Amino acid sequence: ENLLQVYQQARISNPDLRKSAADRDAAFEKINEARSPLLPQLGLGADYTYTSGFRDYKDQNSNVTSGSLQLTQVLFDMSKWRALTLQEKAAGIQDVTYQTDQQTLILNTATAYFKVLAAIDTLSYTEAQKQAIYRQLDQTTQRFNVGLVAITDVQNARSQYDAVLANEVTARNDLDNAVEELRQVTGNYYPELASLNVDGFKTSKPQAVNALLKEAENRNLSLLQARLNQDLAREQIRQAQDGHLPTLDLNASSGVSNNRYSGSKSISQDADIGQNKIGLSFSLPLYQGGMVNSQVKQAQYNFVGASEQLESAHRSVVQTVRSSFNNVNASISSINAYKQAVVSAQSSLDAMEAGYSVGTRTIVDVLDATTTLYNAKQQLSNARYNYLINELNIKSALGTLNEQDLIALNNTLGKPISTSAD
Amino acid sequence: ENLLQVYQQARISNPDLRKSAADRDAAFEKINEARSPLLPQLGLGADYTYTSGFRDYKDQNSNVTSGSLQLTQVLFDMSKWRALTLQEKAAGIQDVTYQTDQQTLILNTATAYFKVLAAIDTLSYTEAQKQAIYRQLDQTTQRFNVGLVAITDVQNARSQYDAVLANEVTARNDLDNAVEELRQVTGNYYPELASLNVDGFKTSKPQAVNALLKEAENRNLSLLQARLNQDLAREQIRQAQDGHLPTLDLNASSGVSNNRYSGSKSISQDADIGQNKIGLSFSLPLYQGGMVNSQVKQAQYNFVGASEQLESAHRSVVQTVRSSFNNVNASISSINAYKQAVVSAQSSLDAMEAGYSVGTRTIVDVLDATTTLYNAKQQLSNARYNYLINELNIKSALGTLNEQDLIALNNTLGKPISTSAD
Amino acid sequence: ENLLQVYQQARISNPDLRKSAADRDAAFEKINEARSPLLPQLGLGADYTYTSGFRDYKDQNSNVTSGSLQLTQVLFDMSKWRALTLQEKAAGIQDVTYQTDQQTLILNTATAYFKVLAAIDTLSYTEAQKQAIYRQLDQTTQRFNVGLVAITDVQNARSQYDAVLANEVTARNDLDNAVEELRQVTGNYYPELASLNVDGFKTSKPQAVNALLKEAENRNLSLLQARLNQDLAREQIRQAQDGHLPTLDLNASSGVSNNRYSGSKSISQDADIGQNKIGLSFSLPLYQGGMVNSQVKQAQYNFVGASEQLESAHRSVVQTVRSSFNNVNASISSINAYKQAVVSAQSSLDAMEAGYSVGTRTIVDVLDATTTLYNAKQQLSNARYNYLINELNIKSALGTLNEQDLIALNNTLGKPISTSAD
Amino acid sequence: ATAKWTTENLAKTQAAQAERAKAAMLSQQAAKAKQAKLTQHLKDVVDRALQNNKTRPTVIDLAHQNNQQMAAMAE
């Protein structure tokens, strides 16, 4: 119906966002799985054994029934604290990816909607071109049936008309596919969409590219992901060089046992045993074969790789920001150029009609001028829609693409128009 | 030689299929590795130790030589049964991926074969345009050397001829590259391929899009993979919330030992001991720090993500089915339109030749009409081949693409034609 | 400034290469982590326990404080030797990937340089076309203001002129974006680049395709990666069927303990214990439930998959080598064809100007001839640049792309030219 | 040559699309290489994790025989 309602339906139903949100929540919950090993771990065990000896122990059999309640707590284990911190950072990265997916949905919805609008305009101008060429063909056919013109003009007009008929077929198919893609994005079939208001259509120059680059370096999401991955690589170095450190544990236990010795040579006696241990274990790896040093060096190389990914992301951001700036400026210049071209092509079409009436020109020239005029109109329409999409591409490069940027567009739109290819 | 024989060599030799089959079989064998932990694990161990004391134990040395034969069986461990079931589901998913790869091979074979045929047609039409323009150029050169025309026509004809020459170069290159891609797909160089029978070429409208969508929902493979991934996520939830459960074990052992105490203060005596234990161990975790709850919540979020992937696959299937329907209908309409265009272009070309003979027109018009005619012919051929590929694309969307769909085509084909660019 | 200096800045600053080098070094360092298990693994431990009995042991409490220095060495463990060898092969594969990335950088730098040059030429020929059409338009406007021509020609010239202005806008934008992408590749903004020397431009036929295919099979990197992956899969089979084998260990230990028994019913006495063990452990799995057999079969299927990947890589290499050969030959033929087309188009433009002066032709024909001429010039330029890129693509297929292949080009270049779109 | 110029430019754009396909194939080769590197990395990591930890006498067999030696020790 318009761009806001389309985007709201999409945001509510689009499954890609809901999957990205699922991933975000899965990471933010895995934080707790990573924190768990630091919390007291209680377990229970129970054993039943029947031991029988066969060498200097013949006829010395035993029946043991034991049950233990083991507890374990970690007083000092830095590898697990680093794992918890690593998981927090990974959750942050997932949140940034979710933001990127929100922006991707906004941009895809806008692009699909305007693709449908562009396809409606293309079909409308293909039909107008067909009507114009058919008008010329009918005029020539009449002037021939009367005897004021030869069959050459009739045949030429017919050939041009048939070519335009094939273009109409292509345009109808493209419109149908544009509507199918829009429904894939949103989830609904839209028979009427708000159309662009070409009368109240304004082209504003984007702000200086230096301000765009500053805001992009500060806000762009492909950079936040890279900075967070760099921090993650630093924390991975720290986790790696935390293997030299010792660990403490507070293993406690409450055990009970029932021993029943049953054998002819069984000298031992039955027992009902109990125990309550409160232990404290300390571990300190001294030499691991160079495993820890190698892990630390690998982590340092991974940090170098992450820094280089950050530089690559910065270069891609700069490139895309400047490209979008140039593309908007070019779309403005193109809108103005095509407006002039459309005006001059209408003038030239009138000139060809006059010349053909006075005999200075031919009919192939008239039909070529008609084709030129309607190609200029199609190019102007596409230029407007590409200007809108390029504004959106800038706002995406800065990472500041949100619903208000769609409210602006929805304000640029106007009366509804049907998406049916009829 | 034709499409069936080409497809047979491809299916027999194509390495992508054989790799996908290797992956399928590897998964169906990993099923057994996943089932193994539920079977009796039998192991053997042997130790030799020399113990020496140095605090309240001086001169109390020992030489122990022990050997044990341990056996283990799992009477209750649901995590391992769930792992086995997960591996069965993963094997099913691999089988579906293999089916998708079979269909992909069929589609690629047909697409490459028709690409070769289309390239042959394009080269033939470019050569026919070259010959037509060369005839016109020779007529003008003769009529000029005799004096019935000026050099303007000769020079215009020469320019058009040179343009056509450049197009011929491009077309030959395209044909050679198309034959090279066909060889990449199949594995053989085909100097003769069965050509399309344009005389007995029929275009049948595809069945209603509702029937296509029903059969697609029922058979399409991008949906079977998604449904199987959803079931896999459900079983992963079950596996995760199967950590609260206890486990039972049937640890058995047959051990023997020889202790030799040798020391001045060695009060103990030598011994040759044996033992046969038949144990039963029971394990039950009561608390782990929210590990299992966190895993279950993560599995639930992954199941949500899998459901959203299923919805995304449903939308993609609907979109592609409707797109293929529209593309077939458009290709039919385009075949008809381009037939009419070719007939009208031939008429207009005759009209231009007549007019040039009577002086009403010029030669640039004649050569433009020739170009138009042969462009229309090329477009008609491309429309036929695209109609065939679009029929295949529908049959692929429904997941019902098999050898019989190629038998239909191979019946659509006809006399052989050479793939050499000469 | 030229291609060598550009490539040097790129090679020194390009972050993709530095990341690939980081990955290479990380693998070559992980070799040591993989070698670490084989080396001795010294470790320390210390425990403090307070045991208290409550069933047949009331008032029998103990306080034990122990400290151990454990050492471990691996005398026979083939799984770990196979892991070390696997890591070494993975390091080799990473080195080959680094080489592929070097070639990719060379190719991308050259492609960006020549894309910028092509854009500059395209904007030069669009400006030239604009100036030519403006001269024709001004001449017609003057001859009209004097009264020697009608307004029809003025309006047609205006329409053509406006169309060229819109093309000029597009060309300026394309040049700006080409500069942005070149800066993304290298890292600097180049206001002046060495231009192509079209006077001393030669096209040499590449060597026979059989020699190309031999050199590719021997040197191409997509094949070295595939062969190394095949060897890696074979070594994985070996690692898998090395699970049937036993393992030996040299477990040594130096332990000390202090037991303090404190209880009313505590019959035992305090102790200050020491021990020095030098053990030798032997492990041998006899049955695991088809685990090892299943792993071996999975590894064999993975080796089959790797062999099929190798065959796929061989087919891709053959295809790309022959394609690059055909593309170079086609670019040569296209250079020649477009040279002849430019000559013929200039002749035809002069012919149209003469005819228009004598009235045989019209002005739309003159402007069409101008457009044709300058399109031919653009096509010739693009053909030259594509010939250079296709030479580079051959040299990439053979895997012999290095700095000397760039020295050849840099010698093919000439005087500098400005990249500013003004 | 406009009737021919349009089709010429369209065939040129098709050749450029084929070049784009080749570039996309190089991209997919890069991505597949990265996936293979990740696979071999996880492979080596899992082999290391399940080798060293288990090579130390953590088997129930070895512990059981050591327990027999400790049992013999007190007699």
Author numbering:
A (entry chain B), B (entry chain C), C (entry chain A): 1 to 422
D (entry chain D): 77 to 151
Article passage:
TolC is one of the most prevalent drug efflux channels in bacteria and is frequently associated with multidrug resistance. Our results indicate that TolC, in addition to its known role in antibiotic export, can function as a protein import channel for bacteriocins.
Application of symmetry during processing then allowed for symmetry expansion of the dataset and subtraction of particles to give a single monomer, after which 3D sorting of particles revealed several classes where KlebC density was weakly apparent. A single class was further processed (see “Methods” and Supplementary Fig. 5) to produce the final 3.1 Å map of the TolC trimer with both helix 1 and 2 of KlebC resolved. In the final model, density corresponding to helix 1 and the N-terminal end of helix 2 of a single KlebC molecule span 109 Å of the TolC lumen; the N-terminal end of helix 1 is located near the periplasmic iris of TolC while helix 2 resides near the top within the outer-membrane β-barrel. The conformation of KlebC observed within the complex demonstrates unequivocally that the KlebC hairpin unfurls, forming a distorted kinked structure in which helix 1 is positioned against the α-helical region of TolC, and residues 137–151 form helix 2 within the transmembrane β-barrel of TolC. By contrast, in the complex with KqTolC this region forms the N-terminal end of helix 2. The N-terminus of KlebC helix 1 is oriented such that it is proximal to both chain A and C of the TolC trimer towards the iris, whilst the C-terminus of helix 1 can solely interact with chain A where the helices of TolC meet the β-barrel strands at the inner leaflet of the OM. The unfurling of the KlebC1-254 helical hairpin required to bind TolC results in the loss of 1994 Å2 buried accessible surface area between the two helices. This is compensated for in the complex with TolC by the burial of 2384 Å2, predominantly through interactions with subunits A and C of TolC (1170 Å2 and 1120 Å2, respectively).
